[PDB]
Amino acid sequence: LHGLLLDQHEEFFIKQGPGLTGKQLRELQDLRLIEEENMLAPSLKQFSLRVEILPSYIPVRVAEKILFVGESVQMF
């Protein structure tokens, strides 16, 4: 609802964070990473998944969607 993850005792599984075709793709990716390292890589995500405390039953994709929702809630 708000991105609020209160962990005063760190009780959560979410931690507050911050083949030629393949060869061509790898070369393009290296060039793109070189481009991005310079002036890209913007402000890192305020949250992260504390997978050390992750629930063995919670799906990872579900956690990713929940992280997106929480980050969006915080950003909004």
């Binding site: 083949g19 030629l20 075709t21 393949g22 061509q24 393009l28």
Partner: protein, 114 residues
């Protein structure tokens, strides 16, 4: 499976000019762009964008002692359940068949060009 052959003919006209070159000129970004342009020009433009995203190019082996018509190969990125519906042995068999077909097509296009 080398079906619609107008794209094959257009790609032959585009690549044989480049398949005369050796394998040391392995810059297939132009090849992928040529694939996209052929799709946009030949009657394969109606092919689904997902079908084009399944389509790919991968040169089988490196052989500068062989022109582009002997080291150039294609690739078919299958997705999800469809990829699980394409065995590696089946992939190898299809690759061998496509290689034979491409060799025959190269012979035929060579005859037409001659």
């Amino acid at each position: 499976l080398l079906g619609q052959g107008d794209f094959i003919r257009h790609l032959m006209d585009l690549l044989k000019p480049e398949l005369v070159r050796p394998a040391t000129t392995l810059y297939q970004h132009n090849l992928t762009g040529i694939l996209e342009t052929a799709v946009r020009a030949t009657n394969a433009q109606f092919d689904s964008p997902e079908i084009l995203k399944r389509l790919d190019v991968r040169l089988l082996e490196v052989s500068p002692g062989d022109t582009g018509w002997d080291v150039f190969s294609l690739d078919y990125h299958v997705d999800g359940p469809i990829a699980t519906v394409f065995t590696r042995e089946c992939m190898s068999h299809y690759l061998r068949a496509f290689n034979f077909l491409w060799r025959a097509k190269r012979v035929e296009y060579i005859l037409t060009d001659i």
